[PDB]
Amino acid sequence: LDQLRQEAEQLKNQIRDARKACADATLSQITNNIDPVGRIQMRTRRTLRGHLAKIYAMHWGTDSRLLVSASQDGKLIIWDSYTTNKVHAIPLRSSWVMTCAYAPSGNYVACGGLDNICSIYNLKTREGNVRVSRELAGHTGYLSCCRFLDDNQIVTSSGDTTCALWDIETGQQTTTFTGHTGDVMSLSLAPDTRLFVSGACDASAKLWDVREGMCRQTFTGHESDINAICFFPNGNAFATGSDDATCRLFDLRADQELMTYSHDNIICGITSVSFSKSGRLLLAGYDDFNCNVWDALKADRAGVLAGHDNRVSCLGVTDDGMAVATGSWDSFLKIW
Amino acid sequence: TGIVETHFTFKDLHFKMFDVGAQRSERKKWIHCFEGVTAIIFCVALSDYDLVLAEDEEMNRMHASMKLFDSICNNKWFTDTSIILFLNKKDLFEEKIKKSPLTICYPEYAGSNTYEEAAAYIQCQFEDLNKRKDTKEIYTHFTCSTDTKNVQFVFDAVTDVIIKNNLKDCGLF
Amino acid sequence: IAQARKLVEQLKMEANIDRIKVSKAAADLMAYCEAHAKEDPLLTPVPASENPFR
Amino acid sequence: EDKAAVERSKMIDRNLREDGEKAAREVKLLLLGAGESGKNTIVK
Amino acid sequence: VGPVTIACLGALATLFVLGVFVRHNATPVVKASGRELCYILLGGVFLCYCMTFIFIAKPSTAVCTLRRLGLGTAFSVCYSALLTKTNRIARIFGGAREGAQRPRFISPASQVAICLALISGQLL
């Protein structure tokens, strides 16, 4: 009722006031001192060729030494940095695919598109190629992202604002949650399968537990939609990928906002955010070909790099910081 | 369900018709994914102008259609792609024009009781902005739903847009 | 009514843990992020001698 | 074994090259309009 | 007197045409030529007009050498410029009906490459 909403929102104001009061000291401490950083932090690796399509997102979630990417012509890409070649080129049934994933064991590859179908491919097969991919459905909105930490449980999003947890063996809707106003854009795999994060308008960095299921972490203050989210290498931290070009670190335990590095040097938004190592180098794509890498610890830009002639869309960083993968619509894959 | 693709090789060219798929989600999320299309099809019913099912008491279907058309034309991703005007009113609109005075479309109506002037007014009022007209041609066809789905008009439009894009990027215009 | 109650209930229980979720958060802020902040930044600069690429 | 990898790298590029203009030659359209705006009225 | 005056008149006319096209590249009719093969053809015409000066000169090892390949090169440049434009126009207007995609090797620079290859064949 109206009274229930009113009392709930006074409670929310009291809670956020208490959080601000308790986190003011932490904000002052973090903003008081900064650490020195480098000047360029760059080392080129190679150039990738053999592509004629666009790319949206990738997933560097394996300890091996390969990279995976998806294209809208209907074929997946699994490339090696040194060889600059693909082990195999399997076709994709869906016309467009926006979800890319890989397994640490290099056996299962997850892809999906606008057809509301989440397809799991067999990276390792006796014949060397996958004959067909199993079909999964049960959503009324466009597929946005999908992740998995093993061959038993898989998390996926949809345009109908719901997060679905499925099992490979069961192959049915095992866990479903009620959604917020805005559509979920991306999900970040937890380091130890603790919780997964959904981001949208008025629901910036909303965390949902995988086991208990209830919501505990919810933040407000980013009106624009959040594009990409990733967990910190140290862990227990959030990322901000709002379309309003707002970049600010977040903490799971603090449950409060931090310093923001907004500036007038740019006028467009951002498409992805990624950590190098414990926030040493913030890598963020922009609506233009030119790109910049910032230093959260140094509160300054680490360097400037473009490597493209069109807006970049995908960005991934190795968990150990061995390599970074990025790409624009110009069919160019460059390791920075 | 998902989007439905209809692949038919009629008129000696492999036509592919892609539907909206009833996304019911954020518009831009599925708008920017469809980048790279040659031509788009814009369908508005004309005989069902009296229908007010778009909104309860705030607006009608004409306002929603006009707003969606303005959003499509003013969008920066499709500023160069040509657009096609289709309808599904062969004789029902003409029959309804006998009783309907055609005054709901425009409050300042200055036409007769027929529908030729109404069609002229709506077709000249669709292009609210002229900046995109020079960059991308707008094709308009009336009395649609022919025998072979108006194969001649769609073939002419697709070949015209194809040759236009071919001569645009070769420094010929 | 019922739908609004669930939203209120979710916000009511979330504030309960969040009230006691501080647990001296600043100690974690200045003690957690420096564990791996010194390995990768020094490891990345390689003078084309041990880098696996090129 | 490096020769086999190069040979395999050659055939994947040729396979992807064939699918390049084959899909590009196929023209793609876009149908968008109001709700139930004669989706089935047009012959498809 | 006749040949030198007619050569001067032709050179002035082609220079005027070059100045007109280089400064009035806004009307679509001049752009429809290609704006590269047109300059190639203008250069060929200028070479044809100015080659008569080499023709009427004191014989020498340098003069004889220049007038041997030029007699073919000057006409080959114009013929290649006329050939490439017609070929690209015909290919663009023919390949649109079947296989809707960008035709290969059509570009303001690629057509220049083909024209110079055709000229270099005669040169070789």
Author numbering:
A (entry chain B): 4 to 339
B (entry chain A): 182 to 354
C (entry chain C): 9 to 62
D (entry chain A): 8 to 51
E (entry chain 2): 569 to 692
The authors write:
The metabotropic glutamate receptors (mGlus) play critical roles in modulating synaptic transmission and neuronal excitability, and dimerization is mandatory for these receptors to exert their functions. In addition to homodimers, these class C G protein-coupled receptors (GPCRs) were shown to form heterodimers as well.
Indeed, the mGlu2 subunit, of which helix VI mediates heterodimerization in the G protein-free mGlu2–mGlu3 structure, couples to the Gi1 protein in the Gi1-bound mGlu2–mGlu3 structure through a similar interaction pattern to those in the Gi-bound mGlu homodimers. Compared to the G protein-free mGlu2–mGlu3, the mGlu2 TMD in the Gi1-bound structure shifts towards the mGlu3 subunit, generating more extensive interactions between helix VI of mGlu2 and helices I, VI, and VII of mGlu3. The results showed that the heterodimer activated the Gi protein at a wild-type level, when the F765S substitution that blocks G protein binding was introduced in the third intracellular loop (ICL3) of the mGlu3 subunit (mGlu2–mGlu3X); however, a considerable reduction of Gi activation was observed if mGlu2 carried the corresponding mutation (mGlu2X–mGlu3). The highly conserved class C GPCR residue W6.50 (superscript refers to a modified form of the Ballesteros-Weinstein numbering system for class C GPCRs), which displays a rotamer conformational change when comparing the inactive and active structures of mGlu2, has been suggested as a ‘micro-switch’ that is the key to mGlu activation. However, in mGlu2, this residue is replaced by N7355.47, which is a weaker hydrogen acceptor compared to the negatively charged aspartate residue in mGlu3. Thus, the corresponding hydrogen bond in mGlu2 is weaker and less effective in constraining the rotamer conformational change of W6.50.
